[PDB]
Chain length 339, copies 3
Amino acid sequence: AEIYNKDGNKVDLYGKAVGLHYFSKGGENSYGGNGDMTYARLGFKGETQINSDLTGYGQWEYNFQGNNSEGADAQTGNKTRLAFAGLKYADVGSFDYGRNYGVVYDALGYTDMLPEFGGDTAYSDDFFVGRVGGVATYRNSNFFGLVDGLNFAVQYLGKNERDTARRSNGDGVGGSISYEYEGFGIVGAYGAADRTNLQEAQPLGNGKKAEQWATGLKYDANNIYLAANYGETRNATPITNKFTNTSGFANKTQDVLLVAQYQFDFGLRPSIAYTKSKAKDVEGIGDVDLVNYFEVGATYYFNKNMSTYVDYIINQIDSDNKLGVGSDDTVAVGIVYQF
Amino acid sequence: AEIYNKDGNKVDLYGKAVGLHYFSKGGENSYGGNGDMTYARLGFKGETQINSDLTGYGQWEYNFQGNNSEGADAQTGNKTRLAFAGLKYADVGSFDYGRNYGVVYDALGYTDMLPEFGGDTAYSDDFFVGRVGGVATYRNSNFFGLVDGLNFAVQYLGKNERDTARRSNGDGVGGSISYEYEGFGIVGAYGAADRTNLQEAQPLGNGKKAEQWATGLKYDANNIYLAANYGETRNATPITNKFTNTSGFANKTQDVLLVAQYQFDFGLRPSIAYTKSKAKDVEGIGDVDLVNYFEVGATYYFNKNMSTYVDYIINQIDSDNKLGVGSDDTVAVGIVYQF
Amino acid sequence: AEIYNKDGNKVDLYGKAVGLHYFSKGGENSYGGNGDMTYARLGFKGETQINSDLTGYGQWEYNFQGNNSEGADAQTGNKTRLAFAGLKYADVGSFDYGRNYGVVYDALGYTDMLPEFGGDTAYSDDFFVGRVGGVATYRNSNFFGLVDGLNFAVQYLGKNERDTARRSNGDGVGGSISYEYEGFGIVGAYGAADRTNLQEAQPLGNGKKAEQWATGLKYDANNIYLAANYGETRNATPITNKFTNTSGFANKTQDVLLVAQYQFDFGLRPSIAYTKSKAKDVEGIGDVDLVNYFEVGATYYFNKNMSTYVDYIINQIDSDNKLGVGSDDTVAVGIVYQF
Ligand SMILES: [Cl-]
Ligand SMILES: [Cl-]
Ligand SMILES: [Cl-]
Ligand SMILES: [K+]
Ligand SMILES: [K+]
Ligand SMILES: [K+]
């Protein structure tokens, strides 16, 4: 909500409280888990006019987990989601630096619209597919204000040598090109980065370069949302063999995302989706499905602040998965207040 | 403070800064401890009108400890207190889910009014007596809008298998019935829940069911506050034998709470209280007093935002306590700003 | 930004998003490090009028690090900076308690004005030089409203026995006297405190008393800022021998701070500084320079909300430093949004 708006500077303090619970078998062997998954969000989105052409901004976002105790495990899953500050200059472009979404997410944000789950390939702290720290993102709107709908972006991923190879990355350059014409929209994104010494030492994944590319096709008009995403990654997708306890990456992945959603005028929004992600050239196995399911769910909007949703996952992953990926179904029930 | 109120949606961002210090002997052997106990609070309480009869809401609250260093122990005692979202519908009732107070606290909140201490039996993450995660609370006002003063509530505690048996719980159902007539108020609360496998493995506490019940009697009118609480728990109250280093629960407890407070028109609020909590059928000992003291303190209100208080505990616990519970007195001095 | 101002009570919720990156050789051997150093701030500064003469207040501040992953290292560098509540009474003085700046910082805040670095001697959780927990600070303005410019303060440091000797302190009393006359300003601060048993056990540092004193001279008028600080500490400055892996304190230090900054009317603010801190009577070595460099940088202000800065450190520390202190240069580039 906009709490301050004086002398060219506007401040929007936002947040949400989500009463969430998962229903599964037993739910260590399921898709999403079992039990309470209550969480809360908090952050600010500010914007200031320096002049008639130039505008400065800065956004922060935090995730608070409310499914923890007040004891020792009080900080489980508590982290900063977004943290960046930038400048946009008329019909030239916008530049920002800090913790922000990757350029491949510009294509993956097409199918990431499900009530609770979905967007399985949009991994956090994973080069260019999700939220990554130390990225210099340049974004352009309408090709310098000349060609309508034609947007392009470029990103510079800084070297992030961390404790775990799961969250580590080297120096990388990514980009995306998008065109939109009356409801329809097409995106073409690609990113390539170096792999750290800790990532190379892992028994899973082999290569000196990590590549990620994705294409998007959506129709967003007349209360209809039909979306499609196809992507492939090289030494980038984080994998874990549960039988041998081994961490690393998949050498080759092939991802298919399909989402169909409709918005009724009285508030209800049904959702039907399909997700398939197959890992290839995996050392020890070969070919294994990481993510495979059908999605059936609905989100009911009371207004702009209150919403309730159900999300059911028809998991197509079988219990004969060589990695040991969860096979059981997961049902999500959530109640949301947001400001 | 109410920072946003437009189009049926009101947002109240609140918080407090408390400059607190405890005075004790040595204070590992005392009731509350010794040294700096500065803390800060932050959170939001929002509410939105969907229609003339229906209202949606969501509340979040966090505790920040300011008695820590900026080094390694920077996150000691930092956690989320409340995190839930719910809907209230005219004269039908209110339903909410997430992290919220238990139904037994509806009776225990009667004597939990002391300047600093008190409410010893209101343990956090303990089935139904305090703040617990994964609770579906249904609350009714004035019996569907028919009988004045007569309120009743029902709660559904979800299974919370955690790292420690101290913070763990199974599936449980609780309830409370309250009647208020001109100053006077009487509450009757009860809750029963399953005990997890980790709780059963502990050398202290034996049973497959955890039960908690409490009754309340208060007079809150004409600047007078006289309150009384009596309760008993089965395999629920968290205990720790300091001689043998053993964790678990007490098989049977008997709790007595008595509070007498007066509010003067110039700001000062004196407080006199008595608390006794005896644990019975304790394996190895038998009968031991967990909490036993007299309370003498006062809170001075400057206005609605600023307040200072002193809280002195006349600890009646002797140094011959077989569990090894603190015997020394504890003096609290605090300065509070709140918005 | 002031978000609430009704009935004598004003609430200022503030924060900043800083997109920061350090440039260094390799940067474990440098002055400031290498890589992403994005961080975010959040907190409130409230003030309420009780009457025409008396005013109550309370301030809180938190640091969020945005250079971390969403995994295990998500809470690295996240802590509370300020947490206190106090009362100011007309021309008598202001008293506050909690986590607050030390009295020696009143002199050290003179040269702590650099774009990114500087203020090396202002160590956090270090008796009186920086931010410390459990301090009762009394501050006086204009000598009870009689002598203009003449301010004096007194502090009472509470005993803070913590996990590490680095962050530990005993009981202490500090004070500061400041006089300002038309641009010019002179400060004289001193503080003395007890050393805990854990601090005494450390192989570095010897003594039962920790002393800190500093003098300040600045000229702050006509867009000119020329500042100077000279100080000496006894068994107070935290040191670490990187060759032997030893923690403790320096027996004697001598600190010299010099800062020269100018403010241009179009927004740009150049900065030239010099810092020297020499540790004496160090057990095993004798005399070693902790901090020694020249500073060249500039901060450009777009308005009151947006700012960009560059900070270059010409490190004069040689690689023959017997403690093993970083010798390489460090370049800082930052983009800031604040509200
Ligand atoms: Cl997310
Ligand atoms: Cl509490
Ligand atoms: Cl700082
Ligand atoms: K998920
Ligand atoms: K307590
Ligand atoms: K620094």
